[PDB]
Design a protein around this ligand. Structure first.
Ligand SMILES: Cc1cccc(NC(N)=S)c1
Length: 209
């Protein structure tokens, strides 16, 4: 059972701007998503200080980067707090509405796309390099869900029946045909070193077989 939803108008407008604006500095998408993973790890780490049982679904706090040249995907996995169904459908977008409005006004006044994370909506920078984004996620308080969008104004949410995840979020970037540099081991290492060197969790770049 798959449910289809319209993005809020402001968010569809932002994703169209991200997809259609000429902007060569696309590598910042990786910084934004690692930053989001780090925040999610911070949250479950803090919650576990007063309720240790929150780590029953997995004690390791880490980020894995998994390029796949055959599928042309780059996957960013974290074992952070995860997202509920309400997060995916309503809560995160409600928050994103005001950050989007502020980011688009800032762009009008001279900001550039790389400051997108200062407005809390860096997630959407995934569409700099991906034609489709799938997000698999499991929060301690909810079931495992898959969120997916190729932009165009809509997204889907379904119960996920793939491999159980324990807890956390997996962002699967289905890369555009001309963006396969982000599957190359040395390019990814360069970007992580440049932008994410001080992230406080182990980042493991998987190599392909
Ligand atoms: C995976 C997903 C679902 C709904 C909203 C968002 N947006 C941000 N996180 S700003 C992301």
């Amino acid at each position: 059972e798959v449910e289809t939803f319209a993005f809020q108008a402001e968010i569809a407008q932002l994703m169209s701007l991200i997809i259609n604006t000429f902007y060569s500095n696309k590598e910042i998408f990786l910084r934004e998503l690692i930053s989001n993973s780090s925040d999610a790890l911070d949250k479950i780490r803090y919650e576990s200080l007063t309720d240790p049982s929150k780590l029953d679904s997995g004690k390791e706090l880490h980020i894995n980067l998994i390029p796949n040249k055959q599928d042309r995907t780059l996957t960013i996995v974290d074992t952070g707090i995860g997202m509920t169904k309400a997060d995916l459908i309503n809560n995160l977008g409600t928050i994103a509405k005001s950050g989007t409005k502020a980011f688009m006004e800032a762009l009008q006044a001279g900001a550039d796309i790389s400051m997108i994370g200062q407005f809390g909506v860096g997630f959407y920078s995934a569409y700099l390099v991906a034609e489709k984004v799938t997000v698999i996620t499991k929060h301690n308080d909810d079931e495992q869900y898959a969120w997916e969008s190729s932009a165009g104004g809509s997204f889907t949410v379904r119960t996920d029946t793939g491999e159980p995840m324990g807890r956390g979020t997996k962002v699967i970037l289905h890369l555009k045909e001309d963006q396969t540099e982000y599957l190359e081991e040395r390019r990814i290492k360069e970007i992580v070193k440049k932008h994410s060197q001080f992230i406080g969790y182990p980042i493991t770049l998987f190599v392909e077989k």
